[PDB]
Design a protein around this ligand. Structure first.
Ligand SMILES: *C(=O)/C=C/c1ccc(O)cc1
Length: 125
């Protein structure tokens, strides 16, 4: 696979500029968002967790379109606050339940190293 653990302290360095192929080798779901929440990258593990087809969701807005169950203070609010501050590093459990069997996950959102983009990492719990 790719040898990176969920929640690693330097994950943003390890995944910096990772192409879509390499991202598909992670053991956990990985989504890269711009500051508005548009999907830039979406890996295979995430698609397995959620059922979404990665290439279909890239370019969509995660909060508006793909994941309305995350359009809440508890998820989007945290994301939006992090984007506004230009800093984000949070881990929390959540349940994904839009047009899918409800699935509890652990989420790690972390600002990407460079630029202004934001990772959403997901694993099952
Ligand atoms: C709630 O609507 C959650 C949906 C969802 C979460 C994560 C994804 O990668 C895709 C859909």
């Amino acid at each position: 696979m790719e040898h990176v653990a969920f929640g690693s302290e330097d994950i943003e360095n390890t995944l910096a500029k990772m192409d879509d192929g390499q991202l598909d080798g992670l053991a956990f779901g990985a989504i890269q968002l711009d500051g508005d929440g548009n999907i830039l990258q979406y890996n295979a593990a995430e698609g397995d967790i959620t059922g979404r087809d990665p290439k279909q969701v890239i370019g969509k807005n995660f909060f508006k379109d793909v994941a309305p169950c995350t359009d809440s203070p508890e998820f989007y609010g945290k994301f939006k606050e992090g984007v506004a501050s230009g800093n984000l590093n949070t881990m929390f459990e959540y349940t994904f339940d839009y047009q899918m069997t409800p699935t509890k996950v652990k989420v790690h959102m972390k600002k990407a190293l460079s630029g202004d983009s934001y990772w959403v990492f997901v694993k099952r719990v």
